[PDB]
Design a protein around this nucleic acid. Sequence first.
DNA 1: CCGACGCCGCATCAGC
DNA 2: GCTGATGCGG
DNA 3: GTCGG
Length: 322
Amino acid sequence: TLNGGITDMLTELANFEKNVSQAIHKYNAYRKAASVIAKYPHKIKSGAEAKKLPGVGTKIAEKIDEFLATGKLRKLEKIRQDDTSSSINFLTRVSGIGPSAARKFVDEGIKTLEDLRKNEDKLNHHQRIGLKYFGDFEKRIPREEMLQMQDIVLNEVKKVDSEYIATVCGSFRRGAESSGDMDVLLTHPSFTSESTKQPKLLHQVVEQLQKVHFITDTLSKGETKFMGVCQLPSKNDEKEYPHRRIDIRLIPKDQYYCGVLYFTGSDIFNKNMRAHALEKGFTINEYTIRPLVAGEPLPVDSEKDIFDYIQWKYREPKDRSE
DNA sequence: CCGACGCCGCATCAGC
DNA sequence: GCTGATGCGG
DNA sequence: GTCGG
Ligand SMILES: Nc1ccn([C@H]2C[C@H](O)[C@@H](COP(=O)(O)OP(=O)(O)OP(=O)(O)O)O2)c(=O)n1
Ligand SMILES: [Ca+2]
Ligand SMILES: [Ca+2]
């Protein structure tokens, strides 16, 4: 939080470019600026000092200059004043509603939560779930709760089949005190890059998590990715825990280290590493690291090996929260 | 100046 | 039905 | 919006 106001300002410009303008690359630009400024270990004294970092260029320089002078950003004060921009922005905070649906909705008269509550009629299933739990999903999850959740997921996965390994990734594996949601990497002997020895491997686990009422809703569900809704059980008389987003990814077992690297993130860490891969002549996805169009996967025994390939020192999870 | 901006699963759509 | 594009979120 | 070449 040394430059919290600067990174906040850049975050919300990024939000605006993603949601309103539908300018995915200006969203990445702004969020890369924000990232590199968030780990800079001095209080930024000027836009000139700021432009010295990679990803801060001329235009963000001038806006950093404006913001320290005055403590605000005209471009943003007027983006907050526009009734249409501020409502499309709000709609995208509903899970399942993005920049396209958000804009379409306001074009139909729909711009408040109340309008959504009246017109669940007009929402696909995901967006209905996103609405249903809109306030819960706005909440963060304390690491203590994450721990209870992980003890449930892992104990229930062991009951299905003992050869399953479940790993919780995301911000939790990076050691954050609070997570936005839960992310579970699953492996099983029967599923490698080479064959799929059994069906329903993901199904069986979700099924069991539904049986004991841990999983409450399904946003989407395929062979290898599950995105749904879970909730901790609560004791007699107590208020109910908030419902929480959960993602399970079944990754072939010999590609664990590429899966856990992907899934540990952060998003911006993933993007910078894969874009640095591209400069060393590689491409990393969540299954393989292949040389460069892609050739054959190179052998991977550990997360560090992926780092060793693109000529990076190893970075423990805790240090990947960019 | 200018390409090129990380990589992908699932849902949905239009075209067939 | 598929295939590819598009949307969305990981 | 930024940047390397
Ligand atoms: N655009 C994205 C989004 C996510 N991920 C990867 C890295 C993330 O860490 C992981 C999980 O997505 P999350 O949104 O849950 O990211 P976090 O766990 O880091 O943040 P939060 O504490 O909000 O849950 O998937 C990615 O590679 N690219
Ligand atoms: Ca998460
Ligand atoms: Ca997640």
